[PDB]
């Protein structure tokens, strides 16, 4: 068993995305009502509000080193903001349906976004130009993520697949004499809502409308399903690897956050809320510190 040591809670209308700042004690929270909040979870206070979307904002992420954050909305825009000047700097337009996720790359000057329009887009945020459109999924792309150390992207789609994309050819598109799908991971019998890379091991987690969390393993030449976490009783909204313990975390519309053993895939702990479905979970890049977005706001907690 484990305990949840709550460090901060916001009370709001439904929250969709959360992003930890890497060095300041801040979270961004993007809300179903279109507002983005910036909270200090050390003081427990609201620092700023950012209103630049119409309708839900599902994507939200900080740049790792620049004073920027990116948001992605059901109004199809990918907005880039400066949190020091408190200005919306520009909109990146191109998606033709809801944006589900947006993140910054850790080294290249890139934003990743994915959309119900079935595409993944890569944008150069310095030049403000779309530099790639990754096509292949045949339904909403619910999640996309950069690999932390290799030129890979993993994506999850309501077409029931998880895709791994080789973007090495994209980085070298103009090298002297594009992205391509490397793996199509099939197994879920319903749409896939989320996917995640392990920070150091060649592992992938996915979670879906089949109420399952699946663990996959890859090499440079093959990828395969390893095992399944069973126990959620509604759609699984999100999943991640604990960066510092051999544990899997998932969050679900069944109103629970579940902790699972990475090696056995057995239940370790279940946390429940009485009235709130969970939509998203994230972990701080450094700290044993997690955030979860739900129907009534956001919780920031340690797991002990």
């Amino acid at each position: 068993s484990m305990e949840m040591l709550t460090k901060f809670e916001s009370r709001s209308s439904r929250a969709k995305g959360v992003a930890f700042h890497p060095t300041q004690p801040w979270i961004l929270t993007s809300l179903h009502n279109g507002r983005i909040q910036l909270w200090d979870y050390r003081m427990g206070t609201l620092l700023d509000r950012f209103d630049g979307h119409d309708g839900p904002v599902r994507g939200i992420a900080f740049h790792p080193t620049q004073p920027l954050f990116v948001s992605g909305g059901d109004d199809y825009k990918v907005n880039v903001w400066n949190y020091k000047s408190r200005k919306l700097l520009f909109s990146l337009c191109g998606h033709m349906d809801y944006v589900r996720v947006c993140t910054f790359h850790h080294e290249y000057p890139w934003i990743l976004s994915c959309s119900d329009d079935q595409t993944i887009r890569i944008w150069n945020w310095q030049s403000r130009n779309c530099i790639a459109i990754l096509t292949g999924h045949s339904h909403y792309v619910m999640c996309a993520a950069f690999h932390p150390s290799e030129d890979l992207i993993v994506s999850a789609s309501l077409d029931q697949t998880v895709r791994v994309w080789d973007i090495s050819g994209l980085r070298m598109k103009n090298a002297a004499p594009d992205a391509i799908v490397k793996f199509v991971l099939e197994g879920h019998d319903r749409g896939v809502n989320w996917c995640a890379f392990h920070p150091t091991l060649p592992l992938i987690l996915s979670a879906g409308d089949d109420r399952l969390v699946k663990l996959w393993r890859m090499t440079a030449s093959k990828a395969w399903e390893v095992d399944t976490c069973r126990g959620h009783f509604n759609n699984v909204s999100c999943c991640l690897f604990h960066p510092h313990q051999e544990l899997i975390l998932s969050a679900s519309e069944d109103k629970t956050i579940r902790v699972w053993d990475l090696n056995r895939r057995t239940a370790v702990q279940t946390f429940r809320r009485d009235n709130d479905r969970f939509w998203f979970i994230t972990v701080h890049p450094k700290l044993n510190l997690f955030a979860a977005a739900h129907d009534s706001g956001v919780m920031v907690f340690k797991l002990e």
Binding site: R14, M142, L158, G191, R277
Partner: peptide, 4 residues
């Protein structure tokens, strides 16, 4: 629908 995943609208929520």
């Amino acid at each position: 629908s995943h609208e929520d």
